Amino acid sequence: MQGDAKVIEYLNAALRSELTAVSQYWLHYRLQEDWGFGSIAHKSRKESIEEMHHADKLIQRIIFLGGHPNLQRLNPLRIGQTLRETLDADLAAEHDARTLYIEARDHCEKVRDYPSKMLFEELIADEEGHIDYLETQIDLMGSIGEQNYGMLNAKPA
Amino acid sequence: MQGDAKVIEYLNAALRSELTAVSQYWLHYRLQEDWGFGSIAHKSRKESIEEMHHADKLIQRIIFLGGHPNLQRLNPLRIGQTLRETLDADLAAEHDARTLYIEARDHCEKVRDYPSKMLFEELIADEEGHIDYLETQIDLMGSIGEQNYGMLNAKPA
Amino acid sequence: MQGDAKVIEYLNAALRSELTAVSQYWLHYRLQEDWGFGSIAHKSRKESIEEMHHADKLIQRIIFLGGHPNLQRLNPLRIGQTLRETLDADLAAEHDARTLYIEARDHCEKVRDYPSKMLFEELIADEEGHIDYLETQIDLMGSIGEQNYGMLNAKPAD
Amino acid sequence: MQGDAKVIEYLNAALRSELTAVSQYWLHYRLQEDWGFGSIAHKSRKESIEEMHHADKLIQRIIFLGGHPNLQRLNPLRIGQTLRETLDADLAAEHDARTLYIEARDHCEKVRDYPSKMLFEELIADEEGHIDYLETQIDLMGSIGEQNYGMLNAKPAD
Amino acid sequence: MQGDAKVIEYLNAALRSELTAVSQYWLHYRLQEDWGFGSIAHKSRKESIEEMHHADKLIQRIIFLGGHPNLQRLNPLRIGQTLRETLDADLAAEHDARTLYIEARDHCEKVRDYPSKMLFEELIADEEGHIDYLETQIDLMGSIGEQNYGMLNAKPAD
Amino acid sequence: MQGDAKVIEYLNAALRSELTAVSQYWLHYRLQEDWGFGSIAHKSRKESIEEMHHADKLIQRIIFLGGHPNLQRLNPLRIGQTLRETLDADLAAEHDARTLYIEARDHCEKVRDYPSKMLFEELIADEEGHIDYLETQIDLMGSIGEQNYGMLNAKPAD
Amino acid sequence: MQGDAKVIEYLNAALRSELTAVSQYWLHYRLQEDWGFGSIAHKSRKESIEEMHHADKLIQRIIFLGGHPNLQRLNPLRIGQTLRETLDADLAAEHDARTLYIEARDHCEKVRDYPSKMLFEELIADEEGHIDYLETQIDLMGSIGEQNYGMLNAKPA
Numbered sequence A, B, G: 001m002q003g004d005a006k007v008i009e010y011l012n013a014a015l016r017s018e019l020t021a022v023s024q025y026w027l028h029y030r031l032q033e034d035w036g037f038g039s040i041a042h043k044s045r046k047e048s049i050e051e052m053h054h055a056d057k058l059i060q061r062i063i064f065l066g067g068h069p070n071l072q073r074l075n076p077l078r079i080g081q082t083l084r085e086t087l088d089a090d091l092a093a094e095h096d097a098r099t100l101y102i103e104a105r106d107h108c109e110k111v112r113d114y115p116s117k118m119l120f121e122e123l124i125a126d127e128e129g130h131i132d133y134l135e136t137q138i139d140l141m142g143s144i145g146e147q148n149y150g151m152l153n154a155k156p157a
Numbered sequence C, D, E, F: 001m002q003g004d005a006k007v008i009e010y011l012n013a014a015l016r017s018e019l020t021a022v023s024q025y026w027l028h029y030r031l032q033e034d035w036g037f038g039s040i041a042h043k044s045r046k047e048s049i050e051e052m053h054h055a056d057k058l059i060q061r062i063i064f065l066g067g068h069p070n071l072q073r074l075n076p077l078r079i080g081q082t083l084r085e086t087l088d089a090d091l092a093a094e095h096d097a098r099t100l101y102i103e104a105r106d107h108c109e110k111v112r113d114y115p116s117k118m119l120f121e122e123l124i125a126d127e128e129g130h131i132d133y134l135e136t137q138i139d140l141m142g143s144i145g146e147q148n149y150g151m152l153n154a155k156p157a158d
């Protein structure tokens, strides 16, 4: 069924966002494990699959509203060089992503597209959940220090 | 059955004490886990539920003696800002709490209310048990140091 | 995640509201048992634990918004002595809570803090189903007598 | 091991008041049951059995102490003539023994017979459990009418 | 159902002699055990419990008959001072009650109270089982020396 | 938890008392087996391990009171050579212990150190049940002969 | 059966040695766990029970040779104040103990009491096993350092 011409645009921008978040944590998963931190790299992995199901949902919904999901392009990817940079790249991502999901959110009701609104309500809560978790790591880290952090976050033969 | 007008007062003061200890470790459970120390925050949690069953018992006993359990007010809550302050706030609490349970204890026999006395005997042993455990943490801590302590006490993705 | 300073005072209020509720539900639990009404007593035990999870959910979130929770105080408790007074009493508490919850949800909707909004909206349903329930006991009290209602909810001497 | 002369008879008045308890309780069981009130009849029965166990512990302790248990005569029993009277009559038997037990509990403190001392401190808590129970059964009875309580404690096809 | 006045007291002397039995037996259990003779102490205990059951049946029957059980006082008990004396003293308690039971068993025949009649004809066979038992334990004792019998009935690490 | 310096010397004494007991019980274990009395031997093995837990419970607590335990020494051991001398011997040790335990509990009651008090009170029951037991073997020795008692507790050549 | 009057003396001296080793590691088990190092305190415990079965064997054997096991006295107990002192007190013990079991060993054959010799062969191998393990700890320790050591060796709520 024909859907708000703008809700779709918003849903595409969103999709460009998760798809970015996907390649970015996936790429982080593989850097952290190769650095010796396979336990945060196990998380970085599940966070990527989580974003995977996010885009899946978004594409589902667009096609519903008779739109065309632009998968073709990503936004600018951030890649840390150090554990801490990895947790910032994610934090700064989840923040941008957020600001957007609300502004898109605040639009779906105006056009009275409510299920598409509570798919932003879902995402917002997810992201914020993800924000919660990132913050704690960076508190944890800059409390016990960046090496213990890594030890705590690695594994031995 | 009508009970010593004072044993009741004592039992209420006690109740005001556990109920304080409940909100204080519960609140600590949620601060420590958000700081990255979910493993001491798992203990802080069970210690709170332990105090939960304590108040439950106290209320049971008052109502027995035909008294009126004042749940309405708590004492002054202590909240650490740092792992160590968290383990002191608890220690100083368990100490006060103790001094009291004995003085109340020493009163139940005089008025010859013995089961109410051996409910202070229970609590005293509990608290002291809890004192035992706190002390060890603060020895452990100020031996291997405050960061290892936290690492030992946290968890990774 | 630096939260809106006004959102936090609303959640802090809901906290003091729920903590209050924990206590007043838990007291009626213990009075009812001792009076005899095993059953309704067992139900108030559980509705207290209900709140126990809500008080917690509030602390969780407040802390995440960078706020500082306040368990240091609670509101005026309504403790009945008859059985109907227990039900009247709980009702009034729920109504109060819901009036607060509806208001806090609107503040959040207006700061565009949506997850707090969905907490208060999931909070409202909670209290409202509670309400539905209580209004049924009192509904049933009117019908079968303020006395057969006690026996229904009384456990036998097992 | 030779006990304090007086401890070895506090034990024997506890034995006395326990055997009467046993008889009394068991009579009510058999009464409350012929009357129609099976459930409370059954509680009445469990409680006889718990005194059976007290009696035993007392007999045991005495013999360890080199004293001679006196199961010969038992106190005057109170037998109810209605359901309401049964609980009453059982509440006084209890109030007595609890009073007895304390007075003995501290004789033991004085002669330094701390395990006897503990026995009694334990026996108190069990007679207290029973009182809290009988009281509460009176509150309930009192409030849901002494006629419905009657029926809450019956059976039909059992 | 209103019983024959006399049947409703034969039942009550059987009740009497049964409760004494119970006490007596149980005392020997606790004695025979502090002495070292655990096994016979344990038989002594099972048998207390079987009288517990007789007492009950008697109490039941009386109440059906509209009579008032009299658990108030019990017969003079015979307490042994040696293992040999315990069995002796238990053998007379038995010879008595068996004698009592028959005399009552045919009162019942005469008033036509055939189920009471049967009760007693049953109680006989159970006191007979016990006699045959105590006798036989005397034969044995008598023959393998009253010192070995002692030990055949003991335990070591139990 | 800075403990009363006098409480600690009492627990230190109980420690030396129990450590002593461990050893003397464990020696009778090994002598009895070698003499033949498998059973009573197996029992002394276990009563030694009993103490093993008490010696431990003392160390635990002392350390918690901020004290310094002393395992460096023990008291004069009583080692019998006959089987009755083993039983006599253990008795005397228990009596000694209990006299110490009763005294230490009173010191604690008076410093208002209640958990140490409840340790010594739970310690007294321990030794007293032990006593009960030993006085039964010797009780049974008097009865069946100082010789059949050995055979009872002897294991056969399996 | 009557046994070498000296093998017995040696076996008693030995017994005085294990019994010393028993109270010493048991006492160490309880100090280390109260300091926050319950995982080395779990070992210190099993090492004590191991020595328990050692004395048990020794007493068995003496009584066999128609001797009288002197349980009455212990040697001078060592008690560390710090994890490291705990691992030295044990090391110095196991060393003394050793020197002795050989000298006793070297005597059982001369008097041609061979099973009593291969009970010293057992003990020697045990002790040396125990020596092996202590050494490794003190290498491990004075390599990663005394705090990591303790962290590695403790546990959290």
Ligand code: HEM
Binding pocket: B022, B023, B026, B049, B052, B053, B055, B056, C019, C022, C023, C026, C049, C052, C053, C055, C056
């Ligand atoms: C009068 C005060 C309270 C009493 C008497 C009480 C009592 C209890 C009891 C008895 C249980 C578990 C039953 C069992 O398994 O044995 C329980 C569970 C629980 N309590 Fe409370 N409680 C009190 C207040 C609180 C507070 C202030 C909180 C925190 C806001 C809280 C949070 C919880 C939670 C979350 C559980 C379930 C376990 C879980 O899901 O984590 N309670 N309580």
Ligand code: HEM
Binding pocket: D019, D022, D023, D026, D049, D052, D053, D055, D056, E019, E022, E023, E026, E052, E053, E055, E056
């Ligand atoms: C002399 C004092 C008495 C003592 C020490 C005593 C002891 C006991 C004990 C120990 C049990 C079961 C405990 C177990 O299973 O370990 C029991 C059950 C029973 N009691 Fe007694 N009793 C006494 C007197 C009585 C009396 C007066 C009655 C009333 C008729 C009675 C009737 C029964 C019956 C019928 C049972 C079997 C119930 C069952 O366990 O299924 N007893 N008693």
Ligand code: HEM
Binding pocket: F019, F022, F023, F026, F049, F052, F053, F055, F056, G022, G023, G026, G049, G052, G053, G055, G056
């Ligand atoms: C002659 C001296 C001792 C001997 C021969 C001895 C022997 C034994 C043996 C053989 C076992 C376990 C049986 C098995 O499962 O294989 C044991 C267990 C035990 N031992 Fe001893 N022991 C002695 C002294 C001590 C001391 C001084 C303590 C500490 C105070 C102690 C504390 C324990 C404890 C607590 C257990 C049971 C496990 C536990 O609950 O932690 N023992 N002993």
Ligand SMILES: [Fe+3]
Binding pocket: A018, A021, A050, A051, A054, A123, A126, A127
């Ligand atoms: Fe997302």
Ligand SMILES: [Fe+3]
Binding pocket: B018, B021, B050, B051, B054, B123, B126, B127
């Ligand atoms: Fe507590």
Ligand SMILES: [Fe+3]
Binding pocket: C018, C021, C050, C051, C054, C126, C127
């Ligand atoms: Fe709620």
Ligand SMILES: [Fe+3]
Binding pocket: D018, D050, D051, D054, D123, D126, D127
């Ligand atoms: Fe009782």
Ligand SMILES: [Fe+3]
Binding pocket: E018, E050, E051, E054, E123, E126, E127
């Ligand atoms: Fe019979």
Ligand SMILES: [Fe+3]
Binding pocket: F018, F021, F050, F051, F054, F126, F127
């Ligand atoms: Fe002991």
Ligand SMILES: [Fe+3]
Binding pocket: G018, G021, G050, G051, G054, G123, G126, G127
């Ligand atoms: Fe060794």
